[PDB]
């Protein structure tokens, strides 16, 4: 890898600079380099990894949606035939997105998840695994689509099982996992009732535990609780 000659600490330093400069492709490359040094990541370092790739893949997903919408209108009744270009360029963006997802899943499999023994790190990485299989599922159409969906489900479920046993209901990782697994149910698994039930139960159980928290923990937890509520409002 092109980052093999840079110090781990220098990679982390430059990832933070890239974030400040909104250079998220660079940030992701720096953090990939840091993961490949082979040491476990701290909480702050896990957050840098997540932020970098979330921004990269988020932009790809937005672009894919623009192009997929144009392509679908191109195939409506009365649309003028315009050649292969829209499909080709949608496929180009799609292939780049799949490549990023495969890269992230590769980092989790080699070897972040297997070395993660603490509940907070293990749940964080398994949530990420669910998330990046979910992004692969958003664009999947072939023989392995159901298996891609189940790979997302299985990662999220393992993360949920650990988080329920080992973390309080207000823990931001537990909350963000539940938020995203709820979206998985609604948008990927065609299970809106499960999505709504999960979001509501997560919100209510967190509400009942807020009284245990400091002001700073309360701010962290209620931020994600508001995202649960926002989704419930969209869906009901």
């Amino acid at each position: 890898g092109a980052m093999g000659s840079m110090e781990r600490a220098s990679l982390i330093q430059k990832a933070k600079l890239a974030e400040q400069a909104e250079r998220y492709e660079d940030m992701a490359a720096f953090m990939k380099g840091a993961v490949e040094k082979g040491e476990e990541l701290s909480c702050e370092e896990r957050n840098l990894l997540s932020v970098a790739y979330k921004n990269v893949v988020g932009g790809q997903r937005a672009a894919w949606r623009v192009l997929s919408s144009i392509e679908q209108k191109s195939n409506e009744e009365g649309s003028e035939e315009k050649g292969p270009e829209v499909r080709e360029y949608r496929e180009k963006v799609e292939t780049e997105l799949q490549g990023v997802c495969d890269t992230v899943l590769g980092l989790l499999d080699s070897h972040l998840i297997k070395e993660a023994g603490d509940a907070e790190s293990r749940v964080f990485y398994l949530k990420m695994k669910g998330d990046y299989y979910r992004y692969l599922a958003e664009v999947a159409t072939g023989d392995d689509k159901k298996r891609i969906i189940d790979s997302a489900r299985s990662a999220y479920q393992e993360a949920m099982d650990i988080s329920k046993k080992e973390m309080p209901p207000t823990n931001p990782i537990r909350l963000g996992l539940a938020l995203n697994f709820s979206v998985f149910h609604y948008e990927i698994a065609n299970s809106p009732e499960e999505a709504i039930s999960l979001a509501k139960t997560t919100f209510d159980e967190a509400m009942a535990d807020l009284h245990t928290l400091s002001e700073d923990s309360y701010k962290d937890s209620t931020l994600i609780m508001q995202l649960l509520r926002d989704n419930l409002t969209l869906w009901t």
Binding site: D131, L179, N180, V183, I224, L227, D230, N231, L234, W235
Partner: peptide, 5 residues
């Protein structure tokens, strides 16, 4: 689009 983190 629903919220995810």
């Amino acid at each position: 689009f629903p919220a995810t983190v």
